[PDB]
Write a protein that binds this ligand. Structure first.
Ligand SMILES: CCCCCCCCO[C@@H]1O[C@H](CO)[C@@H](O)[C@H](O)[C@H]1O
Length: 277
């Protein structure tokens, strides 16, 4: 069906209201002021099997993606005091970075029925999956993180004759933010009693959630669609960059150092400093 409800507690309360209501409306013919006692009549829920079927997290709008401030990893010099161009090698190095995700339910689906669902941050591309989860019934905040260590081998840099180059390594970072909808299909029933008072009979009851709404609002398995909301924000290490600057011309050229495998091992490049050809 097309319809979807954002508060399961409202439905549960209607079912109870209806139960109390019909109990009194039946007596109305005998006692014309019976409805005026609506507040005095007790209803005692005893159990339920309310369940949220197939809870899942769905993106609600496209993620927004912003580059964050670059992480400065280090600086080095490579000096060619020779009359021709030379292949000079940088030192190998490591750097560490933590990928994070935080996720918060902003609008529950009502408190009465517990459910959780997994969320994988989208537009990942790091090769390390980052998952958390959402609670349907509480406004919780779930975090997760993964520490990544980069092993970057020596790089080969062609330096022109009589030139020192300065090399800077830095790590780009992306922030992926957005909203989600928490969806599922509620089934089940509450049971209990309006207890007997004086001459008034006990009414042992069982009401389903699908009975508290119009027949059009139901799916073909009898369930009702529910929806909550949440959001997320993940920080991901992205591209390892090396900028090489020619100290004679002060021109700077940019290179990406690609990943080799998986601890993340990077490739060893052969790169031209500015001033070569
Ligand atoms: C080819 C690129 C060379 C640029 C010089 C990079 C040297 C960085 O070196 C790294 O610095 C880290 C701090 O950021 C330290 O934690 C590591 O131990 C060290 O290996």
């Amino acid at each position: 069906a097309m319809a979807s409800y954002d508060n399961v507690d409202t439905l549960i309360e209607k079912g109870r209201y209806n139960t109390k209501y019909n109990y009194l409306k039946r007596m109305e013919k005998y006692y014309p002021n019976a409805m005026a006692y609506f507040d005095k009549v007790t209803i005692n829920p005893q159990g339920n099997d309310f369940y949220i079927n197939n809870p899942k997290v769905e993106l609600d709008g496209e993620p927004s993606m912003n580059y964050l401030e670059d992480v400065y990893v280090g600086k080095a010099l490579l000096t060619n005091d020779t009359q021709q161009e030379q292949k000079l090698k940088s030192q190998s190095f490591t750097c560490k970075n933590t990928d994070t995700v935080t996720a918060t339910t902003t609008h529950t689906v009502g408190t009465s029925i517990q459910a959780t669902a997994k969320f994988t941050v989208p537009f990942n591309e790091t090769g390390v999956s980052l998952t958390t989860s959402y609670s349907f019934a509480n406004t919780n905040t779930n975090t997760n993180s993964k520490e990544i260590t980069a092993n970057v081998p020596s790089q080969d840099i062609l330096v022109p004759a009589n030139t020192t180059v300065e090399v800077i390594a830095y790590l780009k970072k992306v922030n992926v933010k957005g909203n989600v909808k928490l969806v599922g299909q509620v089934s089940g029933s509450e049971w209990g009693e309006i207890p007997s008072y004086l001459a008034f009979p006990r009414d042992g009851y069982k009401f389903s959630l699908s009975d508290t709404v119009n027949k059009s609002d139901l799916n073909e398995d009898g369930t009702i669609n529910i929806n909550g909301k949440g959001n997320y924000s993940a920080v991901m290490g992205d591209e390892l960059i090396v900028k090489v600057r020619n100290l004679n011309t002060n021109n700077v050229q940019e290179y990406v150092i690609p990943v080799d495998k998986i601890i993340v091992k990077y490739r060893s490049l052969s790169i031209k400093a500015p001033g070569i050809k």
